[PDB]
Amino acid sequence: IKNGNDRVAALLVKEGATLNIENAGTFLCTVVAKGDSDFLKRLLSNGIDPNSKDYDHRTPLHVAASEGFYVLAIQLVEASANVLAKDRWGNTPLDEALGCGNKMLIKLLEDAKNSQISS
Amino acid sequence: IKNGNDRVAALLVKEGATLNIENAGTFLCTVVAKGDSDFLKRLLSNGIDPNSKDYDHRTPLHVAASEGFYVLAIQLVEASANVLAKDRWGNTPLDEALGCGNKMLIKLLEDAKNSQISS
Amino acid sequence: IKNGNDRVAALLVKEGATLNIENAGTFLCTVVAKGDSDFLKRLLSNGIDPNSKDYDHRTPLHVAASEGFYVLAIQLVEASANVLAKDRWGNTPLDEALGCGNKMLIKLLEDAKNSQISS
Numbered sequence: 215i216k217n218g219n220d221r222v223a224a225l226l227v228k229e230g231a232t233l234n235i236e237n238a239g240t241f242l243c244t245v246v247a248k249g250d251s252d253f254l255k256r257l258l259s260n261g262i263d264p265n266s267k268d269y270d271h272r273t274p275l276h277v278a279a280s281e282g283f284y285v286l287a288i289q290l291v292e293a294s295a296n297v298l299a300k301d302r303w304g305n306t307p308l309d310e311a312l313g314c315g316n317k318m319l320i321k322l323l324e325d326a327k328n329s330q331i332s333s
Numbered sequence: 334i335k336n337g338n339d340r341v342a343a344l345l346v347k348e349g350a351t352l353n354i355e356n357a358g359t360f361l362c363t364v365v366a367k368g369d370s371d372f373l374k375r376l377l378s379n380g381i382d383p384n385s386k387d388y389d390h391r392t393p394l395h396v397a398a399s400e401g402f403y404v405l406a407i408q409l410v411e412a413s414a415n416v417l418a419k420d421r422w423g424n425t426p427l428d429e430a431l432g433c434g435n436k437m438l439i440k441l442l443e444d445a446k447n448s449q450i451s452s
Numbered sequence: 453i454k455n456g457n458d459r460v461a462a463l464l465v466k467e468g469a470t471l472n473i474e475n476a477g478t479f480l481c482t483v484v485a486k487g488d489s490d491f492l493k494r495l496l497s498n499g500i501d502p503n504s505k506d507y508d509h510r511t512p513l514h515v516a517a518s519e520g521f522y523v524l525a526i527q528l529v530e531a532s533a534n535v536l537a538k539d540r541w542g543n544t545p546l547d548e549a550l551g552c553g554n555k556m557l558i559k560l561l562e563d564a565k566n567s568q569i570s571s
Contacts, residue, residue, distance in 0.1 A: 237363060244359060247388045269366040269396065270389070277388060280421065302399065303422055337456050337490075368523050371490035401556040403522050404487045434555040437520040 215256045227260065239266035243277050246286050255289065264295035270302045279311035284319035291323065297330035334375055342375065351380060358385035362396045365405055374408060383414040389421045398430035403438055406430075416445040453494050461494065470499060477504035481515045484524055493527060502533040508540045517549035522557055525549075535564040 215223060215233075223231070235241055242264065245254050258264060267273050273296055278287040298306035311323045334342055354360055361381065364373050377383060384392055394414055397405045410416065416426055424432075427442035453461055473479055480500065483492045496502060503511055513533055516524045529535065535545055543551075546561035 240359065240363060244356060244388055269363065270391070270399075272389070280389075303420075303424075305422065369489065370523070371488065401522055403520055404489070405523070436553040 215260065216253065220256055220259070223256075223260070231260075233257075233260045233262045237268070238262070239268040239273070242266055242274050243268055243272065246274060246278055246281060246283065246290075249283070249286070251285055251289075254286065258289070258293055264290065264293040267299075267301075272301050273299055273307065275299075275307035276301060276305075276310055279307050279323065280314055282314050282316050282319075284316065284322070287319060287323060291326040291330075294330060294333075297327045334372070334379070337371070337375075339375055342379070346379065352376070356387075357382060358387040358391075358393075361385060362387055362391065362393045365393050365397050365402060366400070368402070368405075370405060370408065373405070377408070377412045383409050383412045384418065391420050392418045392426060394418070394426040395420060395424070395429055398426050398438060398442070399433055401433065401435065401438075403435070403441070406438065406441060410441075410445050410448075416442070416449050453491065453498070456490070456494075458494060461498070465498065471495070475506075476501060477506040477510075477512075480504055481506055481510060481512045484512055484516045484521055487521065487524075489523060489527070492524070496527070496531045502528050502531040503537065510539050511537045511545060513537070513545040514539060514543070514548055517545055517557060517561070518552055520552065520554065520557075522554070522560075525557065525560060529560075529564050529567075535561070535568045 242257070242262075245257070264274060274290055275287075275295060278290050296307075298308045300306055308324065308327045311320050314320075361373070361376075361383070364376075383394075386392065392414070394406065394409050394416065395418075396402075397409060418426060420429075427446050430438045430442045480492070480495075480502070483495070502513075505511065511533070513525065513528050513535065514537070515521075516528065537545055539548075546565050549557045549561045
């Protein structure tokens with residue numbers, strides 16, 4: 215995946231390939247920090263769980279809201295990985311999105327959270 | 334350092350060597366999550382920064398103090414680690430240790446706070 | 453174990469070896485005094501008794517809990533160490549940990565006490 219050769223990965227997943235990595239929550243949290251949107255798109259194509267949390271119990275929804283990224287959050291919201299999960303500090307990702315700002319993306323995040331809460 | 338070969342590690346220090354790891358703050362706070370002490374004790378002997386910030390600007394002192402690591406906290410402050418730091422939301426490591434609740438850690442944090450005040 | 457050569461240590465275990473040290477209780481409780489975590493962890497892998505009594509009939513759990521060693525306490529109880537022990541004057545390790553004062557240690561001691569009650 216990191217080499218950009220997704221064609222080979224199709225054969226592997228057809229044979230029963232599983233993407234298991236230690237401390238996946240930390241790995242899935244630092245990818246959005248670098249802004250590698252293309253790299254992140256291939257990750258969810260492998261069926262990896264996006265609800266993993268780091269040592270501080272922070273889902274990728276928390277960092278995406280704090281980072282103020284709209285494109286990354288839109289793809290992450292499509293994965294449907296929780297709506298509002300309390301962290302060690304006790305702050306829900308929805309609350310972090312409102313505090314961070316970005317009303318253009320805050321409304322989209324709120325609508326995505328409302329849709330997730332409705333389901 | 335990974336295999337504990339301090340004899341070989343000390344040779345490189347004399348001949349000239351340093352630790353160049355991507356996401357030093359993120360990597361260092363992950364080590365303290367497991368709880369190993371000897372692995373990171375020799376790391377500080379190679380000149381690694383103990384105050385490196387993670388993606389959430391969280392010092393390893395915050396990780397050690399919040400979970401309840403005590404023997405590791407004194408090791409970190411032995412490397413002149415800052416104690417008046419703040420997190421992304423805003424919280425001092427001494428306040429975080431006091432918030433969790435530990436008489437022994439509060440006294441150690443107060444001593445660290447006194448050292449910072451004395452400077 | 454002294455030099456950390458676990459590779460050589462594991463060979464002796466397979467070929468047949470054991471630790472025969474005079475005053476095992478006195479020696480073991482001295483290990484936790486300095487606070488090294490890697491040294492005593494491999495000791496339990498060789499079958500050393502974690503409940504060996506010292507000259508004052510003090511278990512290593514009492515030494516770790518009284519001073520405030522938390523990461524070592526979970527290591528000792530991982531070797532099926534007794535938690536309802538008594539000292540020469542008479543004091544449970546859970547009571548000693550509670551007497552010193554530690555919210556994290558009290559919960560761990562209560563969990564250890566629950567395991568002893570469940571048996």
